[PDB]
Ligand binder design. Sequence first.
Ligand SMILES: Cc1cc(C)cc(Nc2ncc3c(n2)CN([C@@H]2CCN(C(=O)c4cc5nn[nH]c5cc4F)[C@@H](C)C2)C3)c1
Ligand SMILES: CC(C)CCC[C@@H](C)[C@H]1CC[C@H]2[C@@H]3[C@H](O)C=C4C[C@@H](O)CC[C@]4(C)[C@H]3CC[C@]12C
Ligand SMILES: *[C@@H]1O[C@H](CO)[C@@H](O)[C@H](O)[C@H]1NC(C)=O
Ligand SMILES: [Ca+2]
Ligand code: NA
Ligand code: NA
Ligand SMILES: [Zn+2]
Ligand SMILES: [Zn+2]
Length: 791
Amino acid sequence: GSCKGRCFELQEVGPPDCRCDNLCKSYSSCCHDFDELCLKTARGWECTKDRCGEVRNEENACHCSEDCLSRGDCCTNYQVVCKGESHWVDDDCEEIKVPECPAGFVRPPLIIFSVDGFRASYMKKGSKVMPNIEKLRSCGTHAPYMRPVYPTKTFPNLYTLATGLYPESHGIVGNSMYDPVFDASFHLRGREKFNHRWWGGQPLWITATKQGVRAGTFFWSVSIPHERRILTILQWLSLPDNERPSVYAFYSEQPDFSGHKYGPFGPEMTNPLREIDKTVGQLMDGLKQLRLHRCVNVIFVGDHGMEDVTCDRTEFLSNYLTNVDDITLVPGTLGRIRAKSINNSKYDPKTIIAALTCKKPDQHFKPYMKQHLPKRLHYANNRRIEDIHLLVDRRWHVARKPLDKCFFQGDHGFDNKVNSMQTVFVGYGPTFKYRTKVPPFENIELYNVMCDLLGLKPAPNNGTHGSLNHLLRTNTFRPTMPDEVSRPNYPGIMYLQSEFDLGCTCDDKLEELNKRLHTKGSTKERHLLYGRPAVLYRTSYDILYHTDFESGYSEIFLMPLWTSYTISKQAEVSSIPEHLTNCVRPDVRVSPGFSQNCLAYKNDKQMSYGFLFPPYLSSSPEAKYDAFLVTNMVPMYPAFKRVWAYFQRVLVKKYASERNGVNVISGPIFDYNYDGLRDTEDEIKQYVEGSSIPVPTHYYSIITSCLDFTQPADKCDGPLSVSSFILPHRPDNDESCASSEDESKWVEELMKMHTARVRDIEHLTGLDFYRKTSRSYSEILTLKTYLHTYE
Ligand SMILES: Cc1cc(C)cc(Nc2ncc3c(n2)CN([C@@H]2CCN(C(=O)c4cc5nn[nH]c5cc4F)[C@@H](C)C2)C3)c1
Ligand SMILES: CC(C)CCC[C@@H](C)[C@H]1CC[C@H]2[C@@H]3[C@H](O)C=C4C[C@@H](O)CC[C@]4(C)[C@H]3CC[C@]12C
Ligand SMILES: *[C@@H]1O[C@H](CO)[C@@H](O)[C@H](O)[C@H]1NC(C)=O
Ligand SMILES: [Ca+2]
Ligand code: NA
Ligand code: NA
Ligand SMILES: [Zn+2]
Ligand SMILES: [Zn+2]
């Protein structure tokens, strides 16, 4: 019942026995003498020349005695002050070609140095403020920034780091949550947050444990001084082979604390950053003392950034809603609304959304049903995420009532593509590359890398395994392209016009002349630059060849899965000729029975149609007739045709003109259960009236060009440049508050908000892109995880 030679033990003492571990303070279950024995502060955390070869005084926080190395409780600067050795930071970068570990080390250890609220742009303050962190950054592998997950909050991002899952999957969807199944709230006070029922996925410490790799406790009670956390990690590294963990985590509440008080641009931010660097200095001096400075892989990583947010910049729901007493709000840098009571009949989600939609000119939040949020946020598929969500503008709060100098000048939680929310990544050690810069990447990718660093098999996660192989000197995972599951058909012109009764009309009116205009020819070479997309699910689809485009037409969904076409820089935009306005032509390659019918579209009062290949970019008047084929048409709300018509008529030409040509792949997405995955036939909930033509929830486009823009898109030798979108197929433009104005004022704004990774589309379509390129597969995986942020 005491903490004698037990302080910060890795042992798990069950209740009611008093504990001496990292978390005993947080549980409030420590032994009476924990505070005196384990929270020693006597003489601080640094050796001085006077202390060198001192008699061991056990009341001292750390020791400068001759026995301290064998005991493994020397102050981190003992060798420097007493044995005339240099600080790690004062040493030149020396490449770590192989891990230099003591015999008995079966793998290089990993230390995750996690810093709360560390904005990417803090790194610009340089070696003046942070010499130790700047040496790690410059000697090791670093990204300009790392993208957090939404919401850009502490627990959701820390747990994403540990699991490689989106919050919707791992279950920590906020710092605050209500679970209707549990009928309980997740809060930070007391024992609730320790209940395992909240925590999904498989965190790194459990992955390690389950594969026979010992993990040190990632969590630290705030009571434990940072200096003690570093010494405790270093103590654990000195344990014998059978006890010594391979994976460790350090956590700092800084620079988050000061960020909230002073804001991210305050000169007061310098002192927190100096102290963080000092703590990093103690770790690296500590590792060098143990001769583990060329053995251990160190990850310096933040959970999220920090924005300027004052209490003056608060939207109040009481200015929109006639009854705010009938709702519960999760307030601040995001809004989540649910009904307060059940007896209450006044609450109605549709009325609330209407009341919160474009009511004030400068409105600093936007209401969404969670299924209508940008798909890149992946924030819908969890019963803990309220149906009604408010996306708050950066620098702003949303609160229920006015009554709810400011105390705070900094906050986070905003859209994860916001610059101020971006955080840091640095990898240093034998397994990371030497003096290497890598492109920015998403925090969901780190779990796979940390598994690779530790020789662990990752649990299933939202990382793209291989996409970060370019961070590592050595890779124990080689990615393999997935096997195509469905082989395409190549149907010839076979059906007579008399066989078609689709109720479609066109102003049309040499059989083998029709055929040669719809043969392979050079179509694939011109319009499919990166090879045919692979269909990774069981289905029946047809490859259709045209002068201007190639399509994979689904005989199940009665529309293309993808439409591929190349627009040269020099391409000319034409109109839809008046005589072809309402033209839809039967496709004599495809059975009447596996075609859409124009009768469906007339009976559906709310539903019109568009085309995947745009008639506007036809190579000739002749070729334009191919664009009006029933196999090129898709269901579109008149409201959405405004967006799509502008994209096709104006923006594709624009992108082609800016990027020295563009390859475009467009098609439908079905995600009615908003799980971010391709719907099966059963899961599709809307069809065109009196038909089996399924209505897409979204329309995607993948726009590819040469990264070397001095080479045209169709003659690119090296890396590719991609931007993609997943546009919500909405029957209104309520999302766009300026949609009253010309399309030039709002459509591109809407598209930028729904920017997507190629991976996002692959999940939502069951397609695999970029299968025929001159690029390594690991390079292609990085390309597929890229997001164009427009920030
Ligand atoms: C690498 C890694 C992963 C994981 C999952 C774990 C750790 N370690 C760790 N150790 C101690 C803590 C944490 N992680 C996270 N903890 C916080 C304490 C309580 N808390 C807050 O009041 C809090 C609320 C905020 N709202 N806006 N900003 C906030 C900052 C805060 F600290 C939680 C959010 C989490 C302590 C380390
Ligand atoms: C200072 C406070 C923030 C400390 C809070 C720590 C608390 C959230 C931690 C403590 C123990 C953690 C669980 C434990 O490691 C085991 C597992 C198994 C794993 O498969 C799922 C996660 C879970 C339940 C951990 C969740 C986080 C816990 C409760
Ligand atoms: C994220 O990963 C989990 C586990 O593999 C999976 O259940 C989920 O479908 C993934 N989400 C997306 C959008 O890929
Ligand atoms: Ca789905
Ligand atoms: Na109609
Ligand atoms: Na509008
Ligand atoms: Zn935080
Ligand atoms: Zn914070």
